[model samples]
Target: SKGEELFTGVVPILVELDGDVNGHKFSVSGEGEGDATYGKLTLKFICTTGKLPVPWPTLVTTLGGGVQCFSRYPDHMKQHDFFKSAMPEGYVQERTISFKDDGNYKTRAEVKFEGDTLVNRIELKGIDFKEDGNILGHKLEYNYNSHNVYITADKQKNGIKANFKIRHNIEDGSVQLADHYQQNTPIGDGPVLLPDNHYLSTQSALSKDPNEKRDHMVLLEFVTAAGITHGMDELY
Candidate 1:
């Protein structure tokens, strides 16, 4: 059998924060792709800050490539096939991966697939901000079919409010980033898109006060390949 390319090329991950917070600061970015040539999916989080812990939610491609979503957390072993099931087009699966040690924190991950569209989302519950009444958290999501990865806070109902600081350093290349608020600032040089060095950041404050929750969603768009190929590949 011959192995074919599923989806190649790369796109830089950009994030945005939408809520009632201030002074958003971000550092580090990443790339996500589908390379069925190796029977695997690669999410190369291009971060100079650090990498996600090995204990984080493991991922598996729709075609069963990449890492098996297993054993990362022993207690959740039976729940590993969360993404393995086939779904009707446009169907979405949402669930949480609870840790045995942390009772106060909550983490959730979701997967949605239809046609050539694939989305993986992960969110973390946050602690109190400044030991004050305000609270904060983070979300990072990517799609296999689009150049948009979303970053937002979990929905709050108890009038709890939050803030954010999201950043991404476009490690290399002259790739461009797009955000609605015109909030891209260059770092370390003029214009920030040098041939060898490209870096920029975005700051947004999702706002509210006196305990009243509101909708919080921001778009982080960029240009990348025309989505992951639905083609089947046979690799060694």
Candidate 2:
């Protein structure tokens, strides 16, 4: 009955996500709905529960280009007008969209349009007890129109089965979601560890203190049109 209900529930929308990432089991449940009349999209993820492992703060090299972690790759973040500005001097927190604890992790990301539409932003509240900057701890900001973002969950036999893209088309300002299974890459029974160095690499150019050089760093890479991939120190 639960399987039947899950199937029926996913028919209307694919925003609800529940699955494991690396060795950490987690879920981010929320609603994504659009207003065709105003040509506006509202995508919000309220509850993110996964004691996700944190990778070394480095640029996420994607098939398209790379993901900018503000603390390390601070230069180009403002070049394309993706963010308001770069991180100031000495603002050194590396974790972006990552958590270290489980059970109701206080983190969220949302996209919305108010009076106007295109000048919208995606705000992220990551970790409750931390400070309140995109890199510092509490909040993160970016122009969602500039890139594509999605969520992938559920370790399925045929790769990660339930994955979906969530973004608003900049031209039309309409939110779109594409749900599909990644069949090409098959992950056998084991904890989902980091990908090979050839496919994914750390930004060695970035500075790391002696205490930060732990071998248990996670790996986070993205594709031109895919969700955020996960890696872990332990196998699930």
Candidate 3:
């Protein structure tokens, strides 16, 4: 079956990051699913950070004592539940966390502290890759959304807002997948062919950011090649 074949070939890609602390690590995973309603495709994403040190006060006092605390947690907290909830079930995510030295990319970092205590920080970066081989270009964009915290001498509280931008190239490919079909309509009782302009959209909150102020944005764009028809209209 076509569906089975596609799933067989499309395995979710996983990226892992080892944290400096013991038993600390982060991972991002995603996969693609065929959409029957939109003549488009959908990618799902799952990002999870390792178990954090408990005892809010003790952890905060140890890690938050310095100005670099905020910088240390962004990667762990950025993809938390708050952001994961907003993503599709199996969308591809950037696997690497460090900055690439290649000229085709750039990185930006920001940090916030309160009276010598770390609050929050963020890193935004991306790279441009040639659309050759299996090397698809960047699939997502990252940006800081909300970076605020409530802290006291004995306790520490923090929250973050992050944004993700889906790559147009992948969307374009998904659109093409539908276009390749020759039948103008359903041959029998199988999946229906979606209209040319149809597409899918959904929303979810991230996994990490606090519920007090969940701040995150996710946008996906699908581009298609012009001048193609599946029988309804002639190619230009």
Candidate 4:
């Protein structure tokens, strides 16, 4: 039950993510938690079948209170899509949050390369693996109605559903995983395969015995791979 547990456990708070998606070096950091969908890419960590061990922390980053060098546009590919500080030094860029957090813990808050090879990615481990600026055990780039594709890991999404719109802005979109199923396609727990030999599933059912509420998101654009298995399921 999400309401019962806190942002502890092996699950972490995704702080900063860096990558060169579709040839463009882009990135973003978690500003804070208030607006879950805006200003930050907040994520609720999930574990495998068994109980997850907790990853204690010594420090955590304090975000918000200040505006991040921001930018976005439904015009030239969501501005949130490209990350760089206009590293004007000839031709380069930079992000605000340090992917490194070995200096802290007990913190909070939080891509795209839809359609193809995610050239380079930077996963600054969150409190789950504090200070360890490196990729985790798994990574993917799947998306909704994505043109091109790619998936992985043993993941399951329970009571998680979203309504997104694939605006005609080439790669413009927004996803709200609240409320009922909305008009989107009905998806549930099933083994989804990736071209790479990994597998996944999204659960739409609840446990039989206890009857607890499982409403947090899971590895589903989230699994972070590329594929349009549900093309018509565009968000709006």
By TM-score, who's the top model here?
1
Of 3 and 4, the candidate ranking higher by lDDT? 3
lDDT string for model 2 (1-236, tens) is 11111111112112333333233444433333322222222333333553323222311111011112111111211122111121111011111332222111221112111222211112222233223222233122122223333223223431111222223222234332212112112112223312111111112111223453323222222222222244543566
Instruction: Please provide, for model 4 over 71-104, each residue's C-alpha lDDT reduced to its tens digit, 9 standing for 90 to 100.
Output: 1111212222112111111111112222232211
Q: At residue 132, give the lDDT of candidate 1.
A: 23
TM-score per candidate: 0.26, 0.22, 0.21, 0.19
lDDT of 3 by residue, 133-203 (tens): 11223332132122122111111112222221222123234210100000011113332112222111222
What are the lDDT figures for the candidates, one per model? 0.22, 0.23, 0.22, 0.20
Judged by whole-model lDDT over C-alpha atoms, candidate 1 comes out at 0.22
Q: Which is the winner by TM-score between candidate 2 and candidate 4?
A: 2
Better of 2 and 3 by TM-score: 2
Considering TM-score, where higher is better, how would the candidates rank from best to worst?
A: 1, 2, 3, 4
Question: What TM-score, to 2 decimals, does candidate 1 have?
Answer: 0.26
Those runs of model 4 whose alpha carbons end farther than 4 Å from true positions after fitting are 2-14, 35-163, 166-236
What local lDDT score does residue 198 receive in model 1, on the 0 to 100 scale?
Answer: 14
Q: Poorest 10 consecutive residues of model 1 by lDDT?
A: 191-200
Task: Judge candidate 3 against the unseen true structure and give its global Cα lDDT, from 0 to 1.
Answer: 0.22
Candidate 4 lDDT at 152 equals: 18
Please count the clashing residue pairs in each candidate, in the order shown.
Answer: 10, 2, 26, 22
